Design an enzyme around this catalytic site. Structure first.
Site, short mmCIF file in Angstrom:
data_model
loop_
_atom_site.label_atom_id
_atom_site.label_comp_id
_atom_site.label_asym_id
_atom_site.label_seq_id
_atom_site.Cartn_x
_atom_site.Cartn_y
_atom_site.Cartn_z
N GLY B 16 34.87 7.70 -14.62
CA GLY B 16 34.08 6.55 -14.22
C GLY B 16 32.61 6.89 -14.14
N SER B 17 31.83 5.95 -13.61
CA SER B 17 30.40 6.13 -13.42
C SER B 17 30.04 5.79 -11.98
CB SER B 17 29.59 5.25 -14.38
OG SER B 17 28.20 5.39 -14.16
N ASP B 128 26.53 -0.31 0.67
CA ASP B 128 27.10 -0.64 -0.64
C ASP B 128 28.63 -0.67 -0.57
OD1 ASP B 128 26.19 2.43 -0.69
OD2 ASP B 128 27.95 2.28 -1.99
#
Lengths: 49, 297, 81, 331
Positions: B16-17, B128
Site C-alpha cells: 500500500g501507500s 487523520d
RNA sequence: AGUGGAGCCUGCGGCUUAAUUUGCACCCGGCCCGGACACGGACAGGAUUGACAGAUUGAUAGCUCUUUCUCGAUUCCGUGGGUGGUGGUGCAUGGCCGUUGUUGGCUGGUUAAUUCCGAUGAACGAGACUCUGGCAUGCUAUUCUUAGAGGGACAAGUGGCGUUCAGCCACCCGAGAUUGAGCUAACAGGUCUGUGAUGCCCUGUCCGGGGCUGCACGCGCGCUACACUGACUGGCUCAGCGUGUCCUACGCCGGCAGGCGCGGGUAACCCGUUGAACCCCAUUCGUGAUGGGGAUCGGGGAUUGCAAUUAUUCCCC
C-alpha cells in the site's frame, strides 16, 4: 554476561531458569559453530544450578 | 539482491501507500519473520519520518501499537521498518460486500474506544482517523486492533504544565473530510473532542455503510469541504441513526458538547457500550463477519 | 605487435657495429642477420630483421654528416684491426 | 527543509505565482501592498514582499509599467530614503534589485537612475554588488551613459577602497559609453595611474582589457583615440620582470593594436614596429610566462592583423615607404 | 698549522648531592584509585552514598581534620603461597584495503575581485607469457598417403589520422596480416572484535618546587691569546652558497642595546649592485704582564618569555 551472572551464584527464580532453558530449546538444529565460551556458559550453569 | 534494507532484511512487493511514504513487504534474512516497510524519499515536500519515529517510540508498550523494529537511511531514502500487520477496516468492509452487524460494530467501537484512550493517555492526537488507518493484527494478535500512521499526529497537551496548544482559528483540513469534525471543518484547533467525533463518524460509516455527503462534488476541494460542512450542520443528529439504538446518537450528542480543557470519562462510554452489548444478549467471542465468512469459505 | 627489450638492444648494437654492410629492405637485412649474427631462433631473426629495416627507413632520411662521420669512424676501427 | 521543496519560493513562485489570478501579471498585488511599505518597518516581512516583488517583476507588465512608473518611482524612492535613514540590508538589497528590473523594463527616470546609481559606494558588499549588477543590467538592457560616466569620473576625482569599486563599474561599463566620455574616463584612469598603488593599476588594466576586448564601434572609440591611448600606454611598462602587471600591459596593448588594425589597418601596421621591438626587448625577462605570453601575443597579431592584408601591401624591399616599411621594421 | 702550556666552554670518569636522569628519564612533598573465590566477623537496633561551613596545606579539598543531616543493602573488615585479569606476549585461524586504460558531466555576513568562510553524476573496452597451423610439385626413405629437416610472415608494402615518433584505421599482394593449445594467481605491506577451556611472564595519573655537572682531580675535543709580520683610531675598496611570514628597506627618538610609524617580499621581482672580514692607506703606540690578553667581579639600562634568583641574551662605565 550469562556466564558471569551465573557465576554470581544467586538464588535463581525458576521462571528465569525456564527462560534460559527455553533459549537452549531455541538452540536445537542450528549448524553454526558456537564457540568454546558457549560450553563455558553451560559449564557454569551445570556447576551452579 | 537488488536492495537490502538494514543489512538483514530483503525487500519484497508493495502492499500500500502511506500518508508520507510507501508501504512494502520484507522478510528478515536472519530468522525469517516478516516485516512491513515505510519508505520515503530523502528529498521531498514533507520530511516527517523522524517525527513518526519519535511518535512510534513514544507509543510503545501498550496495546494497539505495533512494536518498533528499525529505522535508517538507505542511499536515497529514509526507511522505517515495523512489524507486519493485516488488512485495514475498509478491506474487511469491501470483503463483506458492504454490510456490518450490531455485534461486529460494537466490537470495533470498543476497540477504537480503547485505542483513543491509549493515544490520549499518551498525550497525542491523531487528526487523520479513518477505517484505512486502523489495521488488524496477525497470528495471536488476530483479535486485537492496531493504530498506525502518526504522520499527521501532533502534540495536544503538555506533560509538566498541563497546558494545551492555544486555540486559534483557520486551520487547514489535514485529514479526510468524510470523517472530519465540524470544528475541524471551520478551522477550530483539533482536540480530543473532535477525535471521538471522528470516532462517531467512522462508527456511523460502519453502521449505515454509506454517507449522505459521500461522493459529493463541487467546484473545488475547498468548496467540496465547505458544502459538506453546511450540510453537516443541516443534518440533525437523530436522523443519522434512524432505526438504530440511541446509544450512538447520545454518544454523538455527548462528544459534540465537550469543551476544550475538559477530561471526558471514557469509563462511562465503555460502561454504556458494554451495557448495550449485554442487553442485546451477546458475548465477547470475537466471531466477526470476516471471520465467519472465512470459516464458511 | 610490440617489440621486446632484447630485440631493440641487439638491433642498436648491431647498427653500431655493422651499419656499413646493411641494406634498405627486409631481404638484405635478413640475409645479413643470417651471415653476421648467430641468432638460433628464426622468429627472433625475423623480428631483428624487421626492426633494423625500420631503423634503416628511419635513418637515411636524416642529415648525411652524422652517417658520414659514422662511416669514417667505422672505417678507422676496421683499419685499426 | 522548506526552501528545497517544489512548492517553495525556489521554483514554483518563479513559474505559477506570476500568473496572478490566472493571468500574468497584475501589479494589484503591489498596488495593495503599499500599506505594508508605508509606516511599517518590521523585518522579515518587508524583505519577503520585496523578494517576491523582485521575483515577479520580470514578467513584463510593460505598458502598465510605463503608465504607473511615476507611482512606482515615488514609492520605491521613499523606501530608499527611509531604509537609508534606518540602515537595513536585505530590504534595501531587493528593493535595489526590483528598481533595477523596473528601470531595465522602461526627466524623472534620470532621477531614479541617479538614486539607483548612488548606492554603489555603499560600504556593505551585498548592497554594493546588487547596485552594480543592477546598473550593468539597466545599461545593457543609451541616453543614461553620460550621466553615469560623469558620476564615476566625479566619484574618482573626489577620492581609497571605493576607487576599486567604481573601477569595477568602469570595467563592466566602458563599452557602452560615448567617445568624449571614454576619453575623459581614460584621462582620469591615467591620472590614477600616476599613483603607484598596485591594485588600482591591476584593476584599471582589467578595465582596459574589458574596453578593448569587446571591440567597440566608431561611435564609442575612434582610431585617433586608439592611437593616442596606445602612445600614452607606452610610458609605464612596469619594470622588466614584474609579471603580474606586465602581463596585463602586454594583453591590453595587444587588444588595443588589434582594435586599431580593425578600425584602420595601415595606421595599426605603422604603430606595430614599436610594440614588436618592446616585445622583443621584453623577451629578455627571466620569467617563462611573460615570454610565452609575448610569443602568443605577437603570434596572434601576426595571424589576425598582419597576414590577411599582405595581398594589399604587396612585396616589400629595402626601400619601402608605406606599411611595407613598417613590416620591414618589425621584421 | 698545530693540540699537549694558560683562561673559558664542553665530553667521558671520579668527587659532592635529595637529585646532580640516561645507554624529563632524576629528586623533595600532595591527590586519585587497588580483584573475585573460600571461610570467619559487623549490617536494618543499621551496612554504606552524597554534603554547606571552617581548618590543615605550598595552596583547595566531604579526595583528608572538625560538628551532625541525609542514601539505605547498591554492603565492608580479616586470612590465604588457591587461582587470577581493563594485564603483556607467539602460533593456526575467517573477512577487508592497497598492491604487483578511454570519453563525458546560493539565505548570510566577507573581499578590489565569480574573494573568504558558511548551507548545498555517468558510461566504453581490456591475456603485449611459451609453443604453434594454412602454402611447399623443394632435401631426406616422395607430385596423391607418410615423418625428420629446411623455407615462408617480419606489420613487410601503400594511403590517411597522428606530439610527426610510438601507435591506430583501411586496403593490395600473399596460403597465412592472427587459428589453436598450455598458463585465475600472490601478500615476508598488512588490516579488521573471530575462531583453540592456544604456549608463556606477572596480579600509574595529575600538581607545586628543585636538579639536569653542582668541582679537589685524571683523560680528550674546542674558542681566545701570549703582541711590532701587532693593538687602536680614521679613511678606502671587493664575495659566494643559502634562507625568508619572519627576512627587512626607509622616516623619527636615544650615546648603545633598543622603541615608535610606515612600505616591499610565498621571493633570480624585496632585503640585495647581499657597500663582509682579513687585506690596502695614514695616526697613536715602543719591548714594558705595557695602549698585548681578556677571565672574574661592582653599578645601571634594554630586550625574549607566564617566570631570568644559581648571573637567558645584549649594551655602557
Amino acid at each position: 554476561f550469562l556466564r558471569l551472572l551465573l557465576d554470581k551464584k544467586y538464588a535463581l527464580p525458576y521462571r528465569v531458569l525456564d527462560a534460559l532453558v527455553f533459549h537452549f530449546l531455541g538452540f536445537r538444529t542450528e549448524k553454526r559453530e558456537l564457540p568454546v565460551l558457549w560450553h563455558q556458559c553451560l559449564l557454569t550453569l551445570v556447576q551452579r544450578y | 539482491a537488488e536492495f537490502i534494507v538494514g543489512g538483514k532484511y530483503k525487500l519484497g512487493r508493495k502492499i500500500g501507500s502511506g500518508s508520507f511514504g510507501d508501504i512494502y513487504l520484507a522478510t528478515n534474512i536472519t530468522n525469517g519473520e516478516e516485516v512491513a516497510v515505510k519508505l520515503e524519499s530523502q528529498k521531498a515536500r514533507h520530511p516527517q519520518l523522524h517525527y513518526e519515529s519519535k511518535l512510534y517510540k513514544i507509543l510503545q508498550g501498550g496495546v494497539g501499537i505495533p512494536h518498533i523494529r528499525w529505522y535508517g537511511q538507505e542511499k536515497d531514502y529514509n526507511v522505517l521498518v515495523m512489524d507486519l500487520l493485516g488488512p485495514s477496516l475498509e478491506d474487511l468492509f469491501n470483503f463483506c460486500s458492504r454490510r456490518f452487524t450490531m455485534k461486529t460494530v460494537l466490537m470495533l467501537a470498543d476497540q477504537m474506544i480503547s485505542r483513543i484512550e491509549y493515544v490520549h493517555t499518551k498525550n497525542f492526537i491523531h487528526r487523520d482517523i479513518k477505517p484505512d488507518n486502523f489495521l488488524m493484527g496477525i497470528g495471536r494478535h488476530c483479535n486485537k486492533l492496531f493504530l498506525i500512521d502518526f504522520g499527521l499526529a501532533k502534540k495536544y497537551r503538555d506533560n509538566r504544565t498541563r497546558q494545551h496548544i492555544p486555540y486559534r482559528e483557520d486551520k487547514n483540513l489535514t485529514g479526510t473530510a468524510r470523517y472530519a469534525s465540524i470544528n475541524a471543518h471551520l478551522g477550530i484547533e483539533q482536540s480530543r473532542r473532535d477525535d471521538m467525533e471522528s470516532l462517531g463518524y467512522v462508527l456511523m460509516y460502519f453502521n449505515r455503510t454509506s454517507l449522505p455527503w459521500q461522493g459529493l462534488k463541487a467546484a473545488t476541494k475547498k468548496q467540496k469541504y465547505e458544502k459538506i460542512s453546511e450540510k453537516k450542520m443541516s443534518t440533525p443528529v437523530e436522523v443519522l441513526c434512524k432505526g438504530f439504538p440511541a446509544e450512538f446518537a447520545m454518544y454523538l450528542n455527548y462528544c459534540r458538547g465537550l469543551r476544550f480543557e475538559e477530561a471526558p470519562d471514557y469509563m462511562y462510554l465503555r460502561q454504556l457500550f458494554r451495557i448495550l452489548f449485554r442487553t442485546l444478549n451477546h458475548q465477547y467471542d470475537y466471531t466477526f463477519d470476516w471471520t465467519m465468512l472465512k470459516q464458511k469459505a | 605487435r610490440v617489440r621486446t627489450k632484447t630485440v631493440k638492444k641487439a638491433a642498436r648494437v648491431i647498427i653500431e657495429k655493422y651499419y656499413t654492410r646493411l641494406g634498405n629492405d627486409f631481404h638484405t637485412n635478413k640475409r645479413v642477420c643470417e651471415e653476421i649474427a648467430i641468432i638460433p631462433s628464426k622468429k627472433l631473426r625475423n623480428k631483428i630483421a624487421g626492426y633494423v629495416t625500420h631503423l634503416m627507413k628511419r635513418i637515411q632520411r636524416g642529415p648525411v654528416r652524422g652517417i658520414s662521420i659514422k662511416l669514417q669512424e667505422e672505417e678507422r676501427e676496421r683499419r685499426d684491426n | 527543509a522548506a526552501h528545497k521543496e517544489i512548492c517553495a519560493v525556489l521554483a514554483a513562485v518563479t513559474e505559477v505565482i506570476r500568473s496572478q489570478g490566472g493571468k500574468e501579471t497584475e501589479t494589484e498585488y503591489f498596488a495593495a501592498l503599499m500599506t505594508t511599505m508605508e509606516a511599517v518597518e518590521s523585518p522579515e516581512s518587508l524583505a519577503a514582499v520585496a523578494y517576491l516583488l523582485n521575483l515577479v517583476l520580470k514578467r513584463v507588465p510593460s505598458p502598465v509599467l510605463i503608465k504607473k512608473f511615476s507611482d512606482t518611482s515615488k514609492a520605491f524612492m521613499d523606501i530608499m530614503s527611509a531604509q537609508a535613514s534606518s540602515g537595513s540590508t536585505s530590504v534595501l538589497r531587493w528593493v535595489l534589485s526590483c528598481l533595477a528590473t523596473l528601470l531595465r523594463k522602461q526627466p524623472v527616470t534620470l532621477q531614479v537612475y541617479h538614486g539607483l546609481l548612488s548606492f554603489t559606494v555603499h560600504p556593505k558588499p551585498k548592497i554594493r554588488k546588487a547596485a552594480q549588477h543592477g546598473v550593468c543590467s539597466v545599461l545593457k538592457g543609451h541616453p543614461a551613459a553620460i550621466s553615469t560616466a560623469k558620476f564615476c569620473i566625479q566619484e574618482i576625482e573626489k577620492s581609497a577602497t571605493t576607487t576599486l569599486h567604481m573601477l569595477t563599474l568602469l570595467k563592466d561599463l566602458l563599452p557602452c559609453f560615448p567617445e568624449g566620455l571614454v576619453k575623459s574616463c581614460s584621462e582620469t584612469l591615467l591620472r590614477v595611474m600616476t599613483l603607484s598603488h598596485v591594485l588600482v593599476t591591476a584593476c584599471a588594466m582589467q578595465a582596459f582589457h574589458s574596453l578593448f576586448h569587446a571591440r567597440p564601434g566608431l561611435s564609442t572609440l575612434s582610431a585617433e583615440l586608439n592611437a593616442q591611448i596606445i602612445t600614452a600606454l607606452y610610458d609605464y611598462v612596469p619594470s622588466e620582470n614584474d609579471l603580474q602587471p606586465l602581463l596585463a600591459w602586454l594583453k591590453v596593448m595587444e587588444k588595443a593594436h588589434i582594435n586599431l588594425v580593425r578600425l584602420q589597418w595601415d595606421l595599426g601596421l605603422g604603430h606595430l614596429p614599436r610594440f614588436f621591438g618592446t616585445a622583443v626587448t621584453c623577451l629578455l625577462s627571466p620569467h617563462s610566462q611573460v615570454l610565452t605570453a609575448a610569443t602568443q601575443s605577437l603570434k596572434e597579431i601576426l595571424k589576425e592583423c598582419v597576414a590577411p592584408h599582405m595581398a594589399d601591401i604587396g612585396s616589400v624591399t629595402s626601400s619601402a615607404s608605406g606599411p611595407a616599411q613598417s613590416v620591414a621594421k618589425m621584421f
